[PDB]
Amino acid sequence: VTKFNGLTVLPPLLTDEMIAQY
Amino acid sequence: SQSIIAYTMSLGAENSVAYSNNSIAIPTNFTISVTTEILP
Secondary structure: OOOOOOOOOOOOOOOHHHHHHO | OOOOOOOOOOOOOOOOOOOOOOOOOOOOOOOOOOOOOOOO
């Protein structure tokens, strides 16, 4: 599987490692 | 003496069980539960 003007990419709550534990 | 803390959230406790080629677990008692669910 594959900016500057007020744009903000918020992160997710469940990270990847926490997901694999599920 | 209460304050705010930050931590990495837990995903539930470990509940590992033994194993064998001949092990089995059977219930002997039970309980009747009642749950609630709201849907608009």
